[PDB]
């Protein structure tokens, strides 16, 4: 009964809900707002058109009025459900999240700094000095990137993972739980770290050494295990994961760190308080009745990440920032990229999230297809020249985001709702 609440953007109050915030807020609006008169973007319109001429789909998501921009309760719930699904990692012993992950690599990155930095004392005050440690890595990633050396992965992608265009399942089942050797080669994040002695054997990557034969004969034994374990202790006690050898914990939180460069990048490009370019307000969201240095990442940190984190230590990067998966899914299908060569892979793991004819294996299946694309496109936006013009460019022509403000929203909700329908 005590109410919950999230801050999302400094110009705005925070927002209050019980215990599901996003389902609530989408909820709220349908019931306060006039969403019969909205706009969602043409990503949206699309899905919606395609669905509506097929009878199964129309009524499984309560499609109406063919010609208009707004959508259903359900069908922007059926999307908005897939979206925070995309770096869930579904097994039945998983024990830690993309974001618990990356904050392990990211204490340890910290440490290999050797500017006494005060050492963080948990993945709570990990999350909370990101304003500080991204601007330090994306500077090192930026310097990595100048002096790169050999081929770069296809599509100018640096934070490519390289996998066999026949692997269909995203967990690692190469000798238990790695990757193929390989994997990681191309990788701007796996070579920084490699660099700065974060991470100093890695199966797969480079050659085994007379260090590790050493360690494997007598036993005395690495900054990465080291910060793993001083973080993860309280939540696991002596069963923490050794994450070059459980690789699907590596690869999710390079992933996550990669999610989290590009909203430090995007999120801090201009003020709230400058003058507003869309449309939206938080009426169209909650109704009428209801309601220097840019530093919107750090407003994020402190009021959505830090207190979602807090109540709920399982969520991922897909579920607090579904919008950043939308923009990242669509950047790699729109480049012709393809998972099974290396199409709606959103709607995809819709209809197999909704149906009772695919199993759990087929579900993963597509469940996987989908997050290949995410990190595919999510490599793409951060490896362009300018990630704030492309992450732009996606915003106003699909998803109807034309300023920061919206922006922000955006990547909160998985949608962006505005009235278009005027007299």
């Known amino acids: 009964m005590v109410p919950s609440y999230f801050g999302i953007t400094q110009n705005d109050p925070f927002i209050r809900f019980h215990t599901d915030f996003r389902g609530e807020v989408v909820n709220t609006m349908f019931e306060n707002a006039s969403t019969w008169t909205f706009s969602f973007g043409i ?14 789909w129309k009524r499984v998501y309560h499609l109406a009025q063919m010609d208009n921009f707004s959508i259903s309760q359900e069908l922007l719930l059926g999307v908005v459900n897939a979206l925070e699904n995309v770096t869930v990692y579904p097994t039945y012993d998983c024990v830690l999240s993309d974001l618990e992950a990356a904050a392990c690599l990211l204490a340890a990155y910290g440490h290999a700094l050797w500017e006494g930095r005060d050492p963080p004392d948990s993945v709570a005050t990990v999350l909370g000095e990101l304003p500080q440690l991204l601007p ?5 990633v930026s310097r990595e990137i100048a002096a790169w050396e050999g081929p770069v992965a296809a599509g100018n992608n640096y934070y490519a993972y390289r996998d066999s265009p026949d692997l269909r399942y995203y967990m690692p089942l190469s000798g238990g739980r790695h990757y193929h050797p390989g994997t990681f080669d191309r990788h701007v994040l796996v070579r920084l770290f ?16 007379e260090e590790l034969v050493q360690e494997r004969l007598s036993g005395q034994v690495d900054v990465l295990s080291l ?18 050898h459980e690789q699907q914990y590596l690869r999710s939180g390079l992933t996550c760190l990669a999610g989290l460069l590009l909203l430090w990048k995007v999120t801090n490009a201009d003020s709230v308080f400058a003058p507003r370019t869309g449309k939206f307000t938080l009426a169209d969201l909650l109704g009428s009745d209801a309601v220097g240095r840019v530093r919107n990442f750090e407003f994020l940190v402190r009021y959505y990440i830090g207190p979602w984190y807090a109540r709920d230590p399982a969520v991922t990067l897909s579920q607090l920032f579904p919008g950043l998966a939308l923009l990242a899914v669509t950047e790699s299908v729109r480049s012709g990229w393809d998972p099974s060569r290396r199409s709606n892979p959103v709607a995809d793991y819709m209809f197999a999230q909704s149906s009772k004819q695919y199993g759990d294996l087929r579900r993963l299946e597509v469940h996987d297809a989908l997050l290949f694309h995410y990190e595919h496109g999510l490599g793409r936006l951060l490896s362009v020249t300018l990630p704030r013009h492309r992450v732009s460019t996606l915003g106003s022509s ?13 990547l909160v909700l998985g949608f962006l709702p505005s009235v278009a329908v005027l007299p």
């Open 43 to 56: 990503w949206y319109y699309r899905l919606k058109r395609g669905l509506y001429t097929q009878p199964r």
């Open 136 to 140: 330090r890595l994306a500077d090192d």
């Open 194 to 209: 490699h660099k700065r002695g974060v991470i100093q054997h890695l199966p797969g990557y480079g050659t085994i050494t």
């Open 227 to 244: 910060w793993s374990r001083r973080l993860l202790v309280g939540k696991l006690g002596r069963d923490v994961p050794v994450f070059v």
């Open 398 to 410: 699909l998803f109807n985001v034309n300023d920061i403000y919206e922006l922000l929203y955006f």
